[PDB]
Design a protein around this nucleic acid. Structure first.
Ligand SMILES: [K+]
Ligand SMILES: [K+]
Ligand SMILES: [Mg+2]
Ligand SMILES: [Mg+2]
Ligand SMILES: [Mg+2]
Ligand SMILES: [Mg+2]
Ligand SMILES: [Mg+2]
Ligand SMILES: [Mg+2]
Ligand SMILES: [Mg+2]
Ligand SMILES: [Zn+2]
Lengths: 101, 8, 38, 222, 175, 130, 162, 82, 46
RNA sequence: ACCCAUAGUAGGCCUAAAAGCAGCCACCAAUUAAGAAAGCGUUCAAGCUCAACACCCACUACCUAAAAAAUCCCAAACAUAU
């Protein structure tokens, strides 16, 4: 959260974290929720919604990020680590922010 | 097919 | 950079790195902490 | 559930009335007149006095021979009295005040013309002696910091120790002597004068057994 | 951010130490003094009330006033004006468990204890801990005669302490 | 390497093993939310608002709670206990109250739980309320 | 092993991960009691910097070392292989494990010097301008002291300083 | 110039009333109720020194709360010189 | 001895097998018997 | 290493001020968890850490430190065959 709080959530408009907690492949996605739901990260931009959608459909976990530019980032966490998703999420924040300005 | 003292 | 026989980290932001065959202390927060192994 | 452990209690420990190190004088009370020989064998070989703990639990061990002049005592006193907690710590001297007179000849003069005049006094120290002893309501990690700082400034190889590390040090040396796989040892060869080796050795080497060379101590020698 | 300081009831003033802090952060000192004194108008003057000034980004301030400090409650319930200079060695006051229970009822309403939904036993255990730092000894039962005896001895001790301080101050004058 | 004598169980673990048993026996609603990293004030406030309806908030280490669940009848609650977890346990099901308090925080996920010895999901919980 | 693929279609990026084929350790190791891959196959003290068939199993596709927690090596063997891999790269024995170059980068032509048993990185070593007397000669290290215990088939021990 | 309000000094009043409990100008002093109007746990409170680790039960939170503080005290002692 | 996992949210409605027996038992009984049962039921539930 | 930090209360006394952190005394207690505070900092406060909880197999080593002279470096070389 410290590393992600330095960069901020300024270009981000929504972050939706979808997982089925009774499945066995959601730990990375739940760890991603823990980091982005932190008060430090969330306080960098109060206009960015962070949503946790819990399901019991048997579907694979997903992280759907909507930026203010209108672009989307979909990270499927069934075979991704929390570090990888946070690294990719940081990279796209570092890019989309430059495009807007 | 490797004996106890086999070494690659 | 001050030459030192014994390298010591002077703050939490100092990091030890071995470059060009010798150890260095680098610090971005306080550049005065920079040290070179003698 | 991180497992917590009991902590030692020092409530049963007592602190003296003057925990700090007393002042050491440059020269003895009455100045000496009789000039003494150099007698270098007072810093040579193992120590046979002040090798064990008496009141405290922590000390600075001498790993070599040397002479402590008054300048060394002031460094020890000030450094220790400043870094110690008088309420929970106490320190004592394990070495006497400078008593051995050291003569010097006036600068610029030629060899001869008798012996020089007494210049200053020193305290001889042998290897294996405790120089300063500390104790009180404290662990080893608390005092070891500034004790090693003092040990580094001594004119001989020194090191801060405790009742445990000193004991382990000695038992580790005995273990090395027992499991030594070398069938040849300095003692066996010297005592039996094998190879006629006593023609290049000293009479003291029969007792030092190759662990001592002049004032230097070699702990890795078995 | 939050500004934390104890402000006495009805005695807020523009002078230090709160005033300078308020000015540096952009809050008007006069406005707070007026608002605080008005909202602490029904409380006896001089009662130390822990306040909490929530400063919003546009420098509009909201104040959150709580119940008086436990040091006040214990000192008033013991009849003492100052705590012990060496607690554990000198007993500066005596209160009963009934006194501590009556204090807990008021102090339990403070937002620190109220938001934790703790039983009143927890608040009583805390007040006893604070009493042990004031020099006040909590007793199961205290009679009017036992309190008069202690007050008589405590007066003697305090009078001797004044003489000892005067000697040191007089000696310092001679120095 | 010769194995090391197993470390003897600590007395706190035993106390926690007994408090867990009690929470699971003496309560009916046992929700399992993710203990997201709300500020200390917000966590205290949300825990006071949940106490108005006598919904308690427990927190047990995953190294004591898991063994317990493994050996107990709640063996299907195990997958929910990865990472930070908190229990929202009440003695009488207060589902609608919990749910409306839990909906003030959009990013705090209700993972499921066990109402009246019936393992539910989040929608099972949102249906019990209706 | 696991691959991570980024597919950007229009305005939406999709990050996924797939599990590819994973190699399995050969069956029936000659020393099942062994505590790491090296001693399980009686390879301790019996490999060198040029044993790329061995070394290549413990490195990443771009030449980097793999963690000791993943490979299962002990600290001692892990350090030996690490030094052996550095020497293998410097000797030119791993031509298909070169560093990743970003698009648009073509290294300039550099002088080719054949070398082997290279302990240090070339750029970090200074010339020996003053050799010193025979009794205090400055020596040129060859090989690695980590391999000092390797099986020696000659009566002369490995010379690590020339 | 700023101090607390004057305290009471009458033993009779100080032993029959909780003097400072009432902080409002218009309110009255809080009378101490009889001994049977207070809960039982009030008179079982520890009015003496804190229980030592030996007294505490190794299966209670108080025992491990006491050991945790002693470990923190030891860490602070050891860190001071570090 | 181990409670069954929660059914998927999209899976068709599933009813426990233990009640399936109760459902059939009610049909076999007669209305007069069901009526007598009901009078005691209503009072017992109050 | 990572992670994270609410609260009786600015404990009492001294002090122009002493708010964990100039000194003296105590060092109890709320919260599942957090020293009446181990290191910085503030005129006093704020502010940043450490010891806590949670997360969770960081599953560390706890033995050590350089260099300069004057005509021109100074055998050549070599890690592999019992
Ligand atoms: K020395
Ligand atoms: K202070
Ligand atoms: Mg406090
Ligand atoms: Mg105070
Ligand atoms: Mg203080
Ligand atoms: Mg603070
Ligand atoms: Mg200060
Ligand atoms: Mg506590
Ligand atoms: Mg910490
Ligand atoms: Zn630095």
């Amino acid at each position: 959260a410290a590393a992600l709080a330095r960069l901020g959530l300024r270009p981000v408009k929504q972050v939706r974290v979808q997982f089925c907690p009774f499945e066995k492949n959601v730990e990375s996605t739940r760890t991603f929720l823990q980091t982005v739901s932190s008060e430090k990260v969330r306080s960098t931009n109060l206009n960015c919604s962070v949503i946790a959608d819990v399901r019991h459909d048997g579907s694979e976990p997903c992280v759907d990020v909507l930026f203010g530019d209108g672009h989307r980032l979909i990270m499927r966490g069934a075979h991704l680590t929390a570090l990888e998703m946070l690294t990719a999420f940081a990279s796209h924040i570092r890019a989309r922010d430059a495009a807007g300005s | 097919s490797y004996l106890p003292g086999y070494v690659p | 950079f001050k030459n030192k026989t014994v390298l010591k980290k002077r703050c939490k932001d100092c990091y030890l790195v071995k470059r060009r065959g010798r150890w260095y202390v680098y610090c971005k927060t306080h550049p005065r902490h920079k040290q070179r192994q003698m | 559930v991180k497992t917590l452990l009991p902590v030692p209690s020092f409530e049963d420990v007592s602190i003296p009335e003057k925990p700090k190190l007393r002042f050491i004088e440059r020269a003895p009370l009455v100045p000496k007149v009789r000039r003494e020989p150099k007698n270098l064998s007072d810093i040579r070989g193992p120590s046979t006095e002040a090798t064990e703990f008496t009141e405290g639990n922590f000390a600075i061990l001498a790993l070599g021979g040397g002479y402590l002049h008054w300048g060394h005592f002031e460094m020890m006193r000030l450094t220790i009295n400043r870094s110690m907690d008088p309420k929970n710590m106490f320190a004592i001297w394990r070495v006497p005040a400078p008593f051995k007179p050291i003569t010097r000849k006036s600068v610029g003069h030629r060899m001869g013309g008798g012996k020089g005049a007494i210049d200053h006094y020193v305290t001889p120290v042998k290897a294996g002696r405790l120089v300063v002893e500390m104790g009180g309501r404290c662990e080893f990690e608390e005092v070891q910091g500034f004790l090693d700082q003092v040990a580094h400034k001594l004119p001989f190889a020194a090191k801060a120790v405790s009742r445990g590390t000193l004991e382990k040090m000695r038992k580790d040396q005995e273990e090395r002597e027992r499991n030594n796989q070398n069938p040849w040892t300095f003692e066996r060869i010297a005592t039996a004068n094998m190879l006629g080796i006593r023609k290049v050795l000293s009479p003291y080497d029969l007792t030092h057994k190759g662990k001592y060379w002049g004032k230097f101590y070699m702990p890795k020698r078995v | 951010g939050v500004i934390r300081a104890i402000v006495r009831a009805g005695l807020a003033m523009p002078g230090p130490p709160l005033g300078p802090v308020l000015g540096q952060r952009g809050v008007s000192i006069n406005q707070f003094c007026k608002e605080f004194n008005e909202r602490t108008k029904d409380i006896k003057e001089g009662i130390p009330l822990p306040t909490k000034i929530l400063v919003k980004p546009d420098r509009t301030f909201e104040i959150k006033i709580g119940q008086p400090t436990v040091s006040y409650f214990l000192k008033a319930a013991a009849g003492i004006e100052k705590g012990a200079r060496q607690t554990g060695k000198e007993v500066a006051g005596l209160v009963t468990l009934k006194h501590v229970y009556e204090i807990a009822r008021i102090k339990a309403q403070d937002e620190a204890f109220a938001l934790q939904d703790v039983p009143l036993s927890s608040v009583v255990r805390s007040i006893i801990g604070s009493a042990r730092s004031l020099g006040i000894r909590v007793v199961k039962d205290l009679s009017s005669e036992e309190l008069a005896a202690f007050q008589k001895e405590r007066a003697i001790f305090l009078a001797a302490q004044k003489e000892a301080d005067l000697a040191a101050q007089e000696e310092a004058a001679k120095k | 390497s010769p194995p090391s004598p197993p470390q003897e169980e600590i007395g706190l673990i035993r106390l926690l093993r007994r408090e867990i048993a009690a929470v699971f026996q003496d309560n009916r609603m046992i929700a399992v939310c993710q203990n997201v990293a709300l500020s200390a004030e917000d966590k205290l406030l949300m825990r006071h608002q949940l106490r108005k309806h006598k919904i308690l908030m427990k927190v047990f280490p995953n190294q004591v709670l898991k063994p317990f669940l493994e050996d107990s009848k709640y063996q299907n609650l195990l997958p929910l206990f990865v990472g930070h977890n908190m229990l929202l346990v009440s003695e009488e099901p207060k589902v609608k109250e919990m749910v409306r308090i839990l909906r003030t925080v959009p990013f705090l996920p209700l993972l499921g739980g066990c109402i009246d010895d019936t393992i539910l999901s989040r929608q099972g919980f949102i249906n019990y309320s209706k | 092993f696991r691959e991570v693929v980024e597919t950007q279609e229009g305005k939406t990026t999709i990050i996924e991960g797939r599990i590819t084929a994973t190699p399995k350790e050969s069956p029936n190791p000659p020393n099942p009691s062994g505590q790491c891959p090296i001693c399980r196959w009686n390879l301790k003290h019996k490999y060198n910097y040029d044993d790329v068939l061995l070394l290549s199993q413990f490195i990443r596709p771009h030449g980097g070392m793999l963690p000791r927690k993943i490979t299962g090596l002990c600290q001692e063997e892990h350090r030996k292989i690490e030094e052996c891999v550095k020497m293998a790269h410097r000797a030119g024995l791993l031509p298909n494990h070169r560093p990743r170059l970003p698009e648009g980068v073509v290294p300039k032509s550099k002088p080719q010097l054949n070398r082997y048993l290279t302990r240090w990185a070339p750029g970090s070593v200074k010339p020996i301008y003053k050799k010193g007397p025979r009794w205090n000669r400055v020596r040129m290290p060859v090989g690695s002291p980590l391999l000092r215990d390797n099986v020696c088939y000659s009566r002369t021990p490995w010379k690590l300083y020339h | 110039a700023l101090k607390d309000p004057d305290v009471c000094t009458d033993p009779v009043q100080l032993t029959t009333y909780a003097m400072g409990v009432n902080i409002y100008k218009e309110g009255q002093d809080v009378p101490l109720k009889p001994d049977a109007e207070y809960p039982e746990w009030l008179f079982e409170m520890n009015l003496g020194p804190p229980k030592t680790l030996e007294e505490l039960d190794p299966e209670s939170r108080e025992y491990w709360r006491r050991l945790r503080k002693q470990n923190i005290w030891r860490h602070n002692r050891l860190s001071k010189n570090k | 001895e181990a409670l069954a996992g929660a059914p998927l949210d999209n899976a068709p409605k599933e009813y426990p097998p233990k009640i399936q027996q109760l459902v059939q038992d009610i049909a076999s009984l007669t209305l007069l018997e069901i009526s007598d049962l009901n009078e005691l039921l209503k009072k017992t539930l109050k």
